[PDB]
Design a protein around this motif. Structure first.
Motif, short mmCIF file in Angstrom:
data_model
loop_
_atom_site.label_atom_id
_atom_site.label_comp_id
_atom_site.label_asym_id
_atom_site.label_seq_id
_atom_site.Cartn_x
_atom_site.Cartn_y
_atom_site.Cartn_z
N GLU A 90 -7.75 13.56 -6.22
CA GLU A 90 -6.87 12.54 -6.78
C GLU A 90 -6.36 11.60 -5.70
OE1 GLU A 90 -3.36 12.26 -6.36
OE2 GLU A 90 -3.15 14.05 -5.11
N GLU A 91 -6.10 12.11 -4.48
CA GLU A 91 -5.60 11.23 -3.43
C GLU A 91 -6.68 10.26 -2.95
OE1 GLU A 91 -4.67 12.21 0.50
OE2 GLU A 91 -5.77 14.11 0.58
N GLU B 184 -9.17 9.08 -4.86
CA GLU B 184 -9.41 8.04 -5.86
C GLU B 184 -8.23 7.08 -5.97
OE1 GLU B 184 -6.62 9.48 -8.85
OE2 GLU B 184 -7.91 7.72 -9.06
N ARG B 185 -6.99 7.53 -5.72
CA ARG B 185 -5.92 6.53 -5.78
C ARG B 185 -5.89 5.65 -4.54
NH1 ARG B 185 -2.11 9.50 -2.78
NH2 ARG B 185 -1.88 11.70 -3.37
N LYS B 186 -6.35 6.16 -3.39
CA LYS B 186 -6.48 5.29 -2.22
C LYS B 186 -7.54 4.21 -2.45
CE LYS B 186 -4.89 7.24 1.01
NZ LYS B 186 -4.56 8.26 2.04
N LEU C 19 -8.66 3.14 -5.40
CA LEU C 19 -8.22 2.25 -6.47
C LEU C 19 -7.14 1.30 -6.00
CD1 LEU C 19 -10.00 3.89 -8.42
CD2 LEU C 19 -8.04 4.00 -9.93
N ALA C 20 -6.26 1.74 -5.09
CA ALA C 20 -5.23 0.86 -4.55
C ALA C 20 -5.84 -0.26 -3.72
CB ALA C 20 -4.23 1.67 -3.72
N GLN D 237 -7.60 -2.66 -5.96
CA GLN D 237 -6.60 -3.45 -6.68
C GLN D 237 -6.10 -4.60 -5.84
OE1 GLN D 237 -4.34 -0.08 -7.57
NE2 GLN D 237 -5.11 0.14 -9.66
N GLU E 253 -8.16 0.12 -13.12
CA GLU E 253 -7.37 1.35 -13.09
C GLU E 253 -8.20 2.60 -13.32
OE1 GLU E 253 -6.74 3.34 -15.92
OE2 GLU E 253 -7.66 2.07 -17.45
N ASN E 254 -9.47 2.48 -13.68
CA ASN E 254 -10.27 3.63 -14.08
C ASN E 254 -11.65 3.53 -13.45
OD1 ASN E 254 -11.22 5.94 -15.31
ND2 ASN E 254 -11.05 5.18 -17.41
#
Lengths: 49, 284, 49, 63
Positions: free
Chosen positions: B217-218, B220-222, B224-225, B228, B258-259
């Motif tokens: 999860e960390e 993929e959010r890095k 995705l950020a 973005q 976001e996905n």
């Protein structure tokens, strides 16, 4: 249709872009081209109102 | 087969062949591998071009991470059969009291496993805290029982080298979440209670699944950020010049990121008509 | 009340400073309405400007 | 011949009048390179006219 459209992968849609498969799929029930923007709960309640 | 314009051929094919050879490499993270980040074209090209190349490299990297997809169903069913094992071990155990141990096995036994990707973490945390409460009750050790203070996850009554092996395996899976290393050294010890040994193997499997979940999860959010903020800076910079090319590339760039599915559709929309919006892209 | 500091649930009494800190199950809203009307009546502002 | 497929698109598929063509219109000169890649769906023509309509619409915009 006879099968419910549970899986998220069977719906997709572009907007402002030349997508002739989307335009050729007018009155075709299976893809269900839906917008990117999801309705939040409060605007959902206001729509129901 | 990612395509972009503004660079030579050799570094591009070297990077896209490095991307295929990513999951067999240790400690793979883009903030930990800054050799990709110097190949974006800093102080070399135009501004909209270097935002373009940075966005395509990061989005292709995120597609490659989804292409890797480290498995967790095997350790899920292994955790389920070990949960049934520690439940059947705690069935016949004579506790200090039958009541709260009966309640804790009643919490533990019903949560076999879960279906989708979201429900695993809280059920494995609840199963693990019930398991270690039953473990501390079986050895009759003290525990935090004040209201609002959950008993933390810890291994019970083992040697220091074994728990240090657990922590270095935690570090090795937080560095590389794709290679699975189950039960490296022997944790089955006949000198202790078999309930304690079974619950120690169960809490090792729980530590493994929560580690790979948190690392995934960390990462993929890095990713995705940064894709973005690349989308925001690109839709900033392209909008200053009104042109059909900028209109078309903006209309591609309107979609959400976001996905993984949304970023995949946006990536294939970048690929499939690249010749249309290329006309407003200078080259040095 | 019973506040929690660190694995302990020691009590805390605090002074209610003002009349509005009373629970409305004891001093409700319309009671404060009539209180304000009496207050306006004392200052000869029972017709407000 | 690329010109034969191009006249097949702008005449059999899109029904353009002859006084307007891809030489005198830049967005058709961009879009005809990808309309010819659409192999099938030439029997259904109105979707192509609607697509050309929204493409020339997004050509002339402010946003």
């Amino acid at each position: 249709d006879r099968q419910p459209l549970n899986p998220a992968n069977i719906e997709a849609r572009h907007h402002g872009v030349s997508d002739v498969p989307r335009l050729g799929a007018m009155d075709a029930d299976e893809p269900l081209f839906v917008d990117d923007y999801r309705a939040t709960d409060d605007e959902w309640t206001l729509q129901k109102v | 087969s990612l395509q972009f314009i503004g660079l030579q051929r050799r570094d591009v094919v070297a990077l896209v062949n490095f991307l295929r050879h990513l999951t067999q490499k240790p400690d793979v993270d883009l903030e930990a591998h800054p050799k990709i980040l110097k190949k974006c074209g800093e102080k070399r090209l135009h501004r909209r071009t270097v935002l373009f190349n940075e966005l395509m490299l990061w989005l292709g990297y995120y597609r490659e991470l989804r292409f890797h997809n480290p498995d967790l169903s095997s350790v899920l069913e292994e955790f389920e059969v070990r949960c049934v094992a520690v439940a059947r071990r705690g069935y016949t155990y004579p506790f200090g009291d039958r009541g709260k141990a009966r309640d804790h096995l009643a919490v533990l036994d019903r949560t076999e496993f879960d279906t989708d990707v979201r429900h695993d973490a809280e059920i494995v945390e609840r199963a693990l805290v019930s398991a270690v409460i039953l473990a501390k009750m079986s050895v009759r050790e003290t525990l935090v029982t004040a209201i609002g203070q959950t008993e933390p996850i810890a291994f019970v009554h083992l040697k220091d080298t074994e728990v240090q092996r657990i922590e270095e395996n935690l570090e090795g899976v937080r560095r590389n979440m794709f290679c699975v290393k189950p039960l490296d050294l022997n944790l089955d010890r006949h000198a202790n209670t078999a309930l304690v040994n079974a619950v120690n193997k169960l809490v090792y499997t729980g530590r493994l699944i929560m580690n790979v979940r948190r690392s995934w999860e960390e990462l993929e959010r890095k990713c995705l950020a940064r894709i973005q903020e690349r989308c925001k800076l690109l839709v900033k910079e392209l909008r200053m010049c009104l042109s059909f090319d900028s209109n078309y590339c903006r209309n591609i760039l309107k979609h959400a990121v976001e996905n993984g599915d949304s970023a995949d559709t946006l990536l294939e929309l970048l690929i499939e008509d690249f010749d249309i919006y290329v006309d407003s892209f200078p080259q040095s | 009340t019973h506040c929690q500091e660190n694995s302990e649930t020691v009590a805390l009494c605090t002074p209610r400073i003002v009349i509005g800190n009373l629970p409305d199950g004891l001093a409700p809203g319309p009671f404060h309405e009539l209180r304000t009307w009496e207050i306006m009546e004392h200052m000869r502002l029972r017709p407000p400007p | 011949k690329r010109d034969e497929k191009h006249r097949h698109v702008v005449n059999v598929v899109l029904e353009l009048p002859t006084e307007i063509s891809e030489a005198t219109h830049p967005v058709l000169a961009t879009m005809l390179s990808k309309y010819t890649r659409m192999s099938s769906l030439f029997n259904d023509k109105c979707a192509f006219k609607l697509d050309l309509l929204r493409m020339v619409a997004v050509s002339r915009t402010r946003r």
